[PDB]
Design a protein around this ligand. Sequence first.
Ligand SMILES: Nc1ncnc2c1ncn2[C@@H]1O[C@H](COP(=O)(O)OP(=O)(O)O)[C@@H](O)[C@H]1O
Lengths: 286, 48, 81, 73, 191, 51, 252, 283, 70, 191
Amino acid sequence: AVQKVVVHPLVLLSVVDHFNRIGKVGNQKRVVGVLLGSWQKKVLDVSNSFAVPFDEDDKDDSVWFLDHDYLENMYGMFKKVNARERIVGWYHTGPKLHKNDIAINELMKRYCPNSVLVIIDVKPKDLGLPTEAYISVEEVHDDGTPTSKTFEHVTSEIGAEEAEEVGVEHLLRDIKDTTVGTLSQRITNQVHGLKGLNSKLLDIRSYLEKVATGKLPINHQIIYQLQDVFNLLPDVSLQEFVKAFYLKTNDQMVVVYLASLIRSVVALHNLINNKIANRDAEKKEG
Amino acid sequence: CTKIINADSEDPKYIINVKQFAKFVVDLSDQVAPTDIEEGMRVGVDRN
Amino acid sequence: AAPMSLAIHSTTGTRYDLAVPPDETVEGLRKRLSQRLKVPKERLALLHKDTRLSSGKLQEFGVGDGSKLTLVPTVEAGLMS
Amino acid sequence: ENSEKIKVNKTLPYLVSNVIELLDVDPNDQEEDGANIDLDSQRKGKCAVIKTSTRQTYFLPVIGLVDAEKLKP
Amino acid sequence: DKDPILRRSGMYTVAMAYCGSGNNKAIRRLLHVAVSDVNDDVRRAAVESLGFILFRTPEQCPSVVSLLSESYNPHVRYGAAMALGICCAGTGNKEAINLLEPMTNDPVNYVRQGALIASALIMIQQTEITCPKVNQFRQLYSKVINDKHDDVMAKFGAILAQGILDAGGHNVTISLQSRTGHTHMPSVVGV
Amino acid sequence: LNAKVRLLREELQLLQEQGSYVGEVVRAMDKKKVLVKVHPEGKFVVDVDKN
Amino acid sequence: KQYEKSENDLKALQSVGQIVGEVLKQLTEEKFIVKATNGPRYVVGCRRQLDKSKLKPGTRVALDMTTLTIMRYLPREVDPLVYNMSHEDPGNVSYSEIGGLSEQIRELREVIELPLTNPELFQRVGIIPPKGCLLYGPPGTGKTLLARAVASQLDCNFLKVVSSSIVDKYIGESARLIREMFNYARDHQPCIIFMDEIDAIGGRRFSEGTSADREIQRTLMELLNQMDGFDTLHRVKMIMATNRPDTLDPAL
Amino acid sequence: PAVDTAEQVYISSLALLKMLKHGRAGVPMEVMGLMLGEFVDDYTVRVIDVFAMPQSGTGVSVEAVDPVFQAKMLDMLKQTGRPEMVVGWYHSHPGFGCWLSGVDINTQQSFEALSERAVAVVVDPIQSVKGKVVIDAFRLINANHEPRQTTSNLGHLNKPSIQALIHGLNRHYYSITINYRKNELEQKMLLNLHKKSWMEGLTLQDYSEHCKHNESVVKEMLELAKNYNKAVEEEDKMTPEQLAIKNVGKQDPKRHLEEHVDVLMTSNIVQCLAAMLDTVVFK
Amino acid sequence: EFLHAQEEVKRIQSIPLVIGQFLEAVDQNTAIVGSTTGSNYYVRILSTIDRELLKPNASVALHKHSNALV
Amino acid sequence: MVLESTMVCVDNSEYMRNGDFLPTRLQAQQDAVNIVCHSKTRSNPENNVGLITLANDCEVLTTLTPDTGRILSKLHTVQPKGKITFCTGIRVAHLALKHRQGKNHKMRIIAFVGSPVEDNEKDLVKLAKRLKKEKVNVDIINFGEEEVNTEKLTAFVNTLNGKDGTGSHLVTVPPGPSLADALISSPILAG
Ligand SMILES: Nc1ncnc2c1ncn2[C@@H]1O[C@H](COP(=O)(O)OP(=O)(O)O)[C@@H](O)[C@H]1O
């Protein structure tokens, strides 16, 4: 179990550079490499990466090559440069999960049993994080019977040391709007969150359409999950809930009202001071 | 002004104690001959 | 004479190809490369099969005609020394 | 040439000092390559701390041109 | 676009499309880019374009570049100088020169250079009677060029300005628009 | 606001100029010089600017 | 070997010293306030691979000279004076050579030696062992001889000083010597301090006197408060020696 | 035979982050490394990627320890699609600004002899702050006149610093403009770093913590208003100069009231809007 | 841009600084600050510093050359 | 001398359990590929050789490398199991040699097949035409002798070097017990 995985901006930018270099080389649609890092008691720390030659057969998802010898050599050289970093997992730039993923992970699982897979999309058509992390686990079914290995999603985020923060903030002079005040807490959310929720619901709806129209089979764990989802949705017509909501909105209003009174008094004071200063300047001038 | 404290080896090498500045191990410029300098006599040295 | 025609690749890409006598010593190659490049011979360091050519004759190291030699200069930074 | 460089680096003016203590220090833990210093780590012998005549104490990671055990506080 | 140079091409396109029409919307766009962009060359190209739009009403260019000359960004200052230069070409306005005077001693050098060239463009051919400040500016050119404590870019600007002030003998002016009023396309292209 | 930003943007060079000592004047004297104790150092006979 | 020494010297020539100073506080994760020994206080950084848990407010640290980057921690300083106080050589007198003292040597060992091996007895009876004992008697009787025997035979460390060699001209330096000596003892437990001729600085504190008298009395107040002050002394023992016990401060 | 003044060295985003991180790692030391790239035209010298190097030295000098690493790493990187070869070297001056010293000049001179248009890049990690990064690219002036020719103002826009001049700028070496040009995908990910998940946008706060925070700030505003009263009564019985010192070491009620009012009002507005937006969205 | 400049001047606050005391403020933007070396000075006060924290005889960090109160 | 990057295709199927060809045919193949790798190393110093065992599906046991000690060390611990998959084996071997460390090397393959193949012949010729279009040189050894002939196998080797390609071989070995190394003389010693 991993409670959290933190990637570093350098890793993201390095993967983007890798994809650019291969695509410039062309005739590819995905890239694969490694991820270096350490552990902090279940709070992973990915900090660096390098490439690993790889190729695949698009038509059939059972042919692939991954020069593990390159991986061992590069691990030697990197470990020579920085000892504190040891292999942590592997990454690839395909949009969404592929079928080979379990095969590669079982290959990778030799270098680090607790290997986490981090997908880094390089063309985000969405409003959300650029990475997804996945950990391979055995899944036992109540009816699905055979025990395979499926990826379980684990929380991921982006983190940076002071040097990386300085560099990124320097490069981010292409657009910048801080307005930490209400503008940010209303653009970074509300709108953003509603857009993301809508996109997720639309994906669920597309799958439901596909199942209903016969294009797919039925999965029972999904149906149970969706039933639980629909059972969670709260009801907003209970007198108790309305009462509570109004009570809290009222408290919030009294506080904002006090704030506005304060602000009005201060602005009036500023006007008075400016008027007095103007009058004094005129009298002295006259 | 510096106060010589010791004259070690036959080779000129002089430990002087500049008052309230520092304590060094310096040599003789060409003007003074080795016989002129003894232990314990105030001597003048340059600033470089 | 039977000059040994080698290759001298630089880490920068340029190629200072040159041919030397069979009995040349790594010191001699370093010295000729220094004359060509106008840099001190100490700053240079030749490479072969990921194995520096510390000193001595070229042959017993195995360096032969049509060989690959990487020329790698030193890198130094500091206020002094 | 070694002796010539040595002699030129021994310009006569010295700033006399008294040895304050002759520490024995060893490396703490491994030091990452790319960034490693021979003073903080990578030193096994003894080390000296000296008080120059200018009321300034200094730590000499490499003792210098004299054997350490000869020196005493 | 994301490439800065293509954005600069865009400002130049706005400049050449609305040449002399005073289209308020083109002005809105250029000013918004001047105050809002992140690259500096695009800012300078934007302030400069304003000159091409508003040259039929030279009374209006100072009104919209006076505040922009006194700007923290040096490239915006140079843009305001050259915009005044193109907009008030061959007119010798007192206001344009009033703005161009204080900033001919701007700490940044290329600002001084643009200021000198803009003055030479504005006050072409004028005599002592027509503008009281012509002699001051000739003396300023001479002092700047002879001096040695001053930057090289400033010297370049002063030399070109001396060339401009008395061009083609002393019997040629710069008129973006023909005497009838048509836009003189070679003049726009040249400037 | 423009003035404030300009001042902040220059303030990096203004803050790299040296400082000035604080001395206690002992007695004005002579043409225009003064005798100033510069704690902790000794006294001086310094010049006085025009202003 | 000549060339090895030559190359060792040439490599050694290119290396610089680190200013030694004391860390006074850790502001942020990479900010330390360091008081260089000369006195100027700096705010300085810290090398990335260094156990920042060992830089408490008081650790001695070696600062690089250009950037003043903290670079190494060191154990507390041991002044050369204390190095000499701690490396004397009482010949090899054994308890045999001391003649005619049997009761006295028993008492001395009871005070200083027994609590250093057999504390369980003192825990069973329920008492804290005594700290220090004065040896007073007519000249030539055996005081210093006993102290030398105790130093050589016993196994704990020793510190030997003459109270007439603590005193120093600059104001507030003798007291600092005493304080730093007792700190050293507090470090290398167990240890025995043998103040010889404590009458050189242990003298009744007069109401009326002169400047030097007052300075020595300040030294004596420091000693008194080091013996039994705010900080319990624990496991360092003391012995004095005087031919004039009468001329001693009652508080001592 | 020009080296125009419009020549620039194009540093990618990845190269910059690598340099900066490596430099901050060895804060007291002059850590150094190599940089790979291409020579496109007489006006562009593009630096694509960098790689740290095995090294050892003291705070006063640093030097390489193995070239095997250099050749081997070039071969490995070339295997997976980055054939570019070296264009110069970089190192870090931690707090000394950006300039070249004698030893620096010697190594750079060897590199330049190897390839004519080689560059030296110097970073100053500790001097770099969140926004701006202290950095510059150099090259060596020979003993010959003017080192370079001019056909634009692109050279003269930087006003070289006093320290760099003191240490040899424009006398033994000359600077080159640095460009941080970026492609589309780099731009798209650099904007995507600071973006939180979508759920965080629609999460309320523990309402009890909300109320505690509100009551705490209002209980502070009480005393701030009292001090505001006690302070407005002055400003008439206070000399026009004396006021400029009235606020040094003494709280000022007005500014603190402004700050607290902004905080309270933003926080409460955001919480209210989230509560209403949720109240509608989920059934 | 003002927030940006504020975050850019903060390079003057580089790590190797010199401690000192703030003795008295003489007008704004200047103050007599007593260095730990033992010599008083007449220096410039950085714009960003919150003046509420410049209490008399309050510990402060100065630039190594300019001695400006940072 | 011709820089040529091969990739051996030792097999370890359950049909190696048999001793028809010296003990434990796997042993015969082991000795054969060992001598072959030594031969390649003596062919050209820059030449490399690889091992892609044809197990159930595949596992590249050692990517291209001029040094052979790793090849032979990985060659043991190859206790056979399962059945072979020829198509997947060739496809993986091709993908692997596309990525030569030195792109000047000429791609090639050498195969040690001693099992029955279960795959329609048409797809075999399809993989053959693809390999040909990609300029690949196989050298099939019909070891093991399940068919000791065309096991749907001749067409592949004719197509790959079709039109007198003289680049692909089919050196069939009979079941007579005698280490193939003595048998194979052309594909190994001199094509
Ligand atoms: N009991 C004793 N046994 C042997 N020698 C003694 C004895 N008492 C004194 N001495 C002699 O006196 C000297 C020691 O002087 P000591 O008694 O230790 O100091 P103090 O001068 O304070 O009496 C030695 O030379 C020693 O031979």
